[PDB]
Symmetry: D3
Subunit: 341 residues, 6 copies
Amino acid sequence: KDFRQNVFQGRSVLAEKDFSAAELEYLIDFGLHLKALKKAGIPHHYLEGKNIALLFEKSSTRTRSAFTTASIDLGAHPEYLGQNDIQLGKKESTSDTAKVLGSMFDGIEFRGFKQSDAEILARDSGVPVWNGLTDEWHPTQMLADFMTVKENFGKLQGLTLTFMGDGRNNVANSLLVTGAILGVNIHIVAPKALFPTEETQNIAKGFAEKSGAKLVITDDLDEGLKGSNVVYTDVWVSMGESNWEERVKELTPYQVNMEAMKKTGTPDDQLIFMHCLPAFHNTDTQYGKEIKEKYGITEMEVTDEVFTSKYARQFEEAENRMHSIKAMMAATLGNLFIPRV
Amino acid sequence: KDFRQNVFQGRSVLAEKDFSAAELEYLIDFGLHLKALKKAGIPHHYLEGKNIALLFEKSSTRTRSAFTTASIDLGAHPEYLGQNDIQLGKKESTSDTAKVLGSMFDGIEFRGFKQSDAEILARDSGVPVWNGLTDEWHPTQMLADFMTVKENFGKLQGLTLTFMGDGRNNVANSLLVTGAILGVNIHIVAPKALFPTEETQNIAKGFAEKSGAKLVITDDLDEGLKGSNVVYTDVWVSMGESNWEERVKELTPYQVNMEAMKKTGTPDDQLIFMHCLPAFHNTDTQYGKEIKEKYGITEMEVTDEVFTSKYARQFEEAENRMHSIKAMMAATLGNLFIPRV
Amino acid sequence: KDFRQNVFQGRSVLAEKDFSAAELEYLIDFGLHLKALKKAGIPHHYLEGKNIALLFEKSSTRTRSAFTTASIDLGAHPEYLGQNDIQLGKKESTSDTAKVLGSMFDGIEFRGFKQSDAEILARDSGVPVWNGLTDEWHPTQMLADFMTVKENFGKLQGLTLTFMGDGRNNVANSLLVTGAILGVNIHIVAPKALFPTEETQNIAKGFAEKSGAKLVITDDLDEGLKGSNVVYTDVWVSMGESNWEERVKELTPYQVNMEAMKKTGTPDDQLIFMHCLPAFHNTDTQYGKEIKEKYGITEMEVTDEVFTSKYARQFEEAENRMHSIKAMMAATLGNLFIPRV
Amino acid sequence: KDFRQNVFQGRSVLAEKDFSAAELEYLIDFGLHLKALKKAGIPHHYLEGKNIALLFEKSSTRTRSAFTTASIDLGAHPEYLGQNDIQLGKKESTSDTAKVLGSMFDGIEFRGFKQSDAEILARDSGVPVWNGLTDEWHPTQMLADFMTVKENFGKLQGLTLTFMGDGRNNVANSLLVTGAILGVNIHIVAPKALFPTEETQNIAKGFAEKSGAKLVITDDLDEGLKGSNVVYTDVWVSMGESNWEERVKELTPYQVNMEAMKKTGTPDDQLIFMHCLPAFHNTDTQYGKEIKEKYGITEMEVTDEVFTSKYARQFEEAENRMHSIKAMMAATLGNLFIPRV
Amino acid sequence: KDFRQNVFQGRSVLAEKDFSAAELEYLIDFGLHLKALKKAGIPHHYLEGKNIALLFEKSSTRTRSAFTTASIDLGAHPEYLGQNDIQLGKKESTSDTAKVLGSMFDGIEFRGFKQSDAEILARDSGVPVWNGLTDEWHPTQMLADFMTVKENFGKLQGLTLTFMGDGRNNVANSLLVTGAILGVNIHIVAPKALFPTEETQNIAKGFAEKSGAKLVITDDLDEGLKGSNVVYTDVWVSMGESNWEERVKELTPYQVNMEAMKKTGTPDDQLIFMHCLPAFHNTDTQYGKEIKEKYGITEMEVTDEVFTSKYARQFEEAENRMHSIKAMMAATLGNLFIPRV
Amino acid sequence: KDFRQNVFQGRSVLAEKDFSAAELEYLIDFGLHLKALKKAGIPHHYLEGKNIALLFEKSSTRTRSAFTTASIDLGAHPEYLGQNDIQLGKKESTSDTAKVLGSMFDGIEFRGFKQSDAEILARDSGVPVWNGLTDEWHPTQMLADFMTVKENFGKLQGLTLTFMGDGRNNVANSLLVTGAILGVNIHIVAPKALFPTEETQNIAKGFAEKSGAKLVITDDLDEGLKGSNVVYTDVWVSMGESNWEERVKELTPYQVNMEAMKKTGTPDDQLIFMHCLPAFHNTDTQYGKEIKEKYGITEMEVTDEVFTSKYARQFEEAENRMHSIKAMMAATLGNLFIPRV
Ligand code: NI
Ligand code: NI
């Protein structure tokens, strides 16, 4: 008879909607606990002796670094398999690879385009698989983000988080869905063209009706920002993206500047700014210089003033990438005793 | 702000009454979880880098071995201080010693006569203190015993444990109170002269009113034994004890033989024999042979036939000393994330 | 006076022909023992504190992974140096690189085209060098493969292993020689155009005289397959290979299908299928889809039916890459006592 | 050529007069550094893999515990060899034993009566030997004590330390000699009968004339106490010691009470109390009760008021036993780079 | 299917006669290899994570130390349980103790009088049990001793080892049997009253027939010493032994002096002296002084001159206790691959 | 109150000018001390549990291997981020990245073009940053080189090091400034066109006025070489460089041949050859062969004869990359006690 009890052990983490509010909060709180342990020098090698594969079909170095430092702190050894090292379903079926990866490694991180690849990995490897970012979901960023909110405010339910800018990018989609599950009010403040899809809004609405989260999807700043505890943003455009100027044109009214922070009406001690990074907040980059020389644009989604102001939590948030991934890997692979969530 | 959550962390374990049924069950289940891990060779060095002081006012080598091996499995180093090494309250106050011990060691085991010494250790050391046996309580034995019961039957509540023999020895006292807390029915079957004291009985009664445990103290063998899922015993006489012959004479009718096992009415798959050991079940000892010449006794509290029967779980129960101590130390000192019991 | 005894210690593994049947069996048996150890969670950090350099002139991720996870299980830390990181003999002589490498690392894996590079590395580095694949030899694969055969059968001598298809591919060449050294009967069933070379045949014939191995090279399916304990195949064509249609047409009759298994005559309890992977057994790849569209071909060297049947050992054999490499690195660098092979 | 540089490595620590002020201060400062490291959770396993013998001819459990916890923190394993385990020069010559101890262990602690035994151990073992207390010297207590003074005041030279009571016991002798080396003024306030010997005073006077330490040996409280930064004491009598009443009679005027603390004229922020322990400061012990029942004596060398007052540093001092022994073992055995003191 | 191969794994070492010459040489050779490893700082934690119980019915500190330091070098943690801690078969049967011991610890050292206790431990504990000395056998000493001979000479077979003095002492008995198994010629030079028993002589004669060992038992010094490669002795009398003066007088002519070495005829490069220790070779003991005063005796079984001469290997042999025990514990518990001995 | 003392702890190593001669000597000597330790297998896991980021804007595999092996020997885990992984200042500011890197990693290596990027890394990361090579400085190469000089000669001050060839390449620049700081006489022997810039010369001059170093920049081979204890060179042309033919033509008279070694006037025991590598000393490379066909050159900056002569120390110098980096990391991150340099 198997007397091991742990509701997370062996589970994959592919999509944040596969986890209940209680499960998400556990992992968030576990992350804050391990953050405290690491600050104090308290050992927590729950993955002692293990091997972990870190698959990236596209370079995602901050996520890699979070998974790497997390693995080491837990006593596991991470190996990076990037785009030149691995191409799933290209010359060998994803299923065949999963099986061989699973026979050698104890856990698998997967970052790549297809959610379906993540699922086959989870189905066939026989080991926990963690989604480091797909086109559909970004669960590790969500864990970090809500950990950061709770780190600052102490209690998630009934707080308001406002995302400004592209309400159709996959971080906004994840924030809307994850906030709904957790009972956090979510405002998406975007141009109409970039409102979340009906499919995304429906998934979020389903969860919100059970949690009591209020969800507002609007192109009006003043309506959107009022009451926010968190103002969150992300980049408007990519490296030589299509319809670049059209996107910038429509997005520029939704820049997080100090006026936007004022529009919330929220007291200073109840308001923070978040950004999943990288942020175009100045011209300190090669890209930044080029954009300026061509358009005279000096900041995009956030002003430097806000980025460097007392509201700023994006650096704590980026550190929390690591602490949250650590709790996730530990819950899921460390054979810890967790009889109940 | 401390985001560490653990209801056990830093707590001492001096008395089983100081723990709720849910806390006791957690520690039992954790012991079973950890027993599995060790069997599988899954690492669990939760006390990595730590030092532990093991104090013994009297030799208690089975308790010592259990704390020792448990400490090593957890990553901690134990140092044994016995009767020739330490004499708490003899020349230096227990308070003074407790403060010094606590400044060098991360945790302290104490086995000695005075509960007050255990309490002072806990009050002044600043570290977890674990009671390896006092005149008043034996909590590690209780964790091992109810762990053993659960390992065999599952669900503890509603089962029936019967202690037969000296109903006033400290294991019987502990079993009565602890079963009462856990909702396990407890029968003490003893001579009238060796019924547990009014205080022990009334402490147990207070817990039983809330848990639903049925408590029976009786001199009637057939009333006592009926319905038992466990038949538990212990030595009749100890260390050339006073009133020796009288104790044996009042006690022998309460020997655990196959005929006693049959009086329970219980089927082979719902019935086990337990004994905290050492046991006088044969003539295989210097003490045993002397008792045969003087008294014609070849077995005392349990016959060799019961001790070697299909019902015997005493050797499992004794290994469980180690696994249960490990759960206790781990929960209390490992800085594990335990938000809710 | 050096009282250390180990026949493997400090030796490079560059070519399977460089070791006797006794030495190869020891490594194989060592691998099956270590596999057992890992399954039981039994520690074996024979390479504790060591650094290992993994050189790959071309991407070879399955091999990279086996070496990585093996290193870690043994307590050594592997660093991957791939094509963008190293070019032996391009800018700096392979000899100079070997010396510096050998001065920092404790062992060196090399995968590259030229056997002479493996030899210069072994000659000049001063550390064990392991050939992860060259144009001439694939020793670690042969270790995995015969470990797999023994895992299924026990005594290797007198068994029959049949490779079907491109009998000129370096896997088939290695199998012929290694099976020859080991006293395994090797059958190569290939169109005459793809028979092993006279040089390959002559090397294997030398070893087989002494071992008693029966070598058969034939284009006749029925004569080749008859009495096979193992049916082994590999890809007909690689990434954008010349003579593509020629190769596919001549190799098509040598597809491992259920009829091919049936042709062996061998009872179910004496017959396995093996494939060094990746295999084209279905249409679950981008490549597989392009072949199905252009040619109507759905499966090549092995049918999905054989691939997913009770005969299939590919995935065990693939896992065994790791266990076999661990034995090889352990014998060769672990400073283990091995007085006699 | 040996490029290792460390002026302490391989040296024994048998007598504090064998070390210069610079060497003593280094070890003191090193102790405060390692204390900081341990509080912060910073690893410092400088004796990783080592075995250490802890010899005690007489039970000295606080010293054992300091050596034990120190060894573990440094990564060394301590084994306790007490009076029933070892009798030097009894049935085997001390020299023969030293040689065998030295061939198995990496370091040796020795606590026993004869300084000459310590020296033979140091001469013949080939490993560092540390004196845990002999009739002649107590170097580990001195390291702890001056570490404690520096921990509180920040700079040893020109401070005043006053020992009150038995100026002939070996801690007072060591304090006088060690204070002289370090440039700390030392007052010994004792009855004339218990003034330090001429031999001890001469050793101290020799060192003091080079350091500029002032040394006062007096039976006058008011002369002795004035200007003290430290008031230090120790027990007047042993367990059933000879001339017990005569010693108590002469010593009782030299009790450290609150009046004595006042006699210093030192401001509150520049005054501390020290005691090497155990202290008879109340009646919380078996011995304490017995002394009271026979003499009505309730406190001896220090009052409870002083022991529990804001001047008290004896518990920090007792913790520092460990931190100081740790620096001593690390300097002397860890193969650290220490080119200069 | 268990693919683990190891002839020693799980086996107890209770009596040297229980192992073949091949097995004994392997252990010996394994010891010299591990000694080399330790001298080079090469890791070998083959017992990583294990707990070991060290039982001593009587104080035996040199043996205790060898086992302790060996355990630690191998990664296992030893706990000492001495006379005040354990009394096998006194209160509790040795069988019951064995079972519980075996359930917590991974191996068990036993030093005690009764061989039957060693056997019950091996039979009931379920773990390897190592005999650290019984009335009948001293295997670990024989391993140290022949390791020492091989360390000096190479090929053991055909060598001559001569024990001088009490040919009835259990060292001499073990040497006769072990030398017999190994094909070493054994000479026992003893007064006729102290010849080995007929039982001891007959055991050794059985083994010598097959090994070709020449056994000589004689009271003639010149015939016994002739051709010796090793002159080995041990104490004439123990702690308060009866027949003291009788024993000393009859044994006095068998003192190992320089004349005894000269009597061998053996060239300096082929002659060593050995003594299992402690040795009475001078007057540097309390005991030695009492013998000098009472009897004028200054040296007994060996002169200081021989003890400190170019022939002396006692201290190497003593260090070798450790290296030989490490090999024995490593072979028997390390789960090392040993397919053939 | 922080009683931690270490002058290096937390400092970055961006430029050799930022360190005093005494600090540089300490790190050199520490490197030699640590080289001995590793040779002896003495543990020195000073960075136990740490994570280190190794950034490379361009491939630099010898520098990488040195940081990697050094990290592992110290107990730290390195992760390599190369040109396809990280692009500092391209899309995210170096400041932003530095902050994130520093929140996850305990230390950062940086190899890239801009010194300003190294400085920003140091300013904003909050961790030690080590310069693995910029356009302006190469401090780890300098530590390795002067470590090598001292390893051969001892005393650095008063010796003479001569760099021959391109007197403007960054190794020559570094050698001039660093020798100047350390009091080593430096001769640059170069064509006039390749004399070090006025700035490099004037920086060196400022250090030489204080140290007593004699600096000579000259085109005269015989004036340059005379009195040299070291002849040091480096490649003439790099990565299909511009002005290629002109560089070779002005450079060839400055080749290191045996005749150059003889012009020093220095005896065989006071003279060594150094080269930071890779070296073009033969035709054993693809690049070498092309240069032979196009130019008739079979060797460039150094002949094979000098490269393989008794003077050659370049392979020692290259191993020393690792040991010197280890000293740097250890002093800067190990939290070692270093009160005074
Ligand atoms: Ni790594
Ligand atoms: Ni221990």
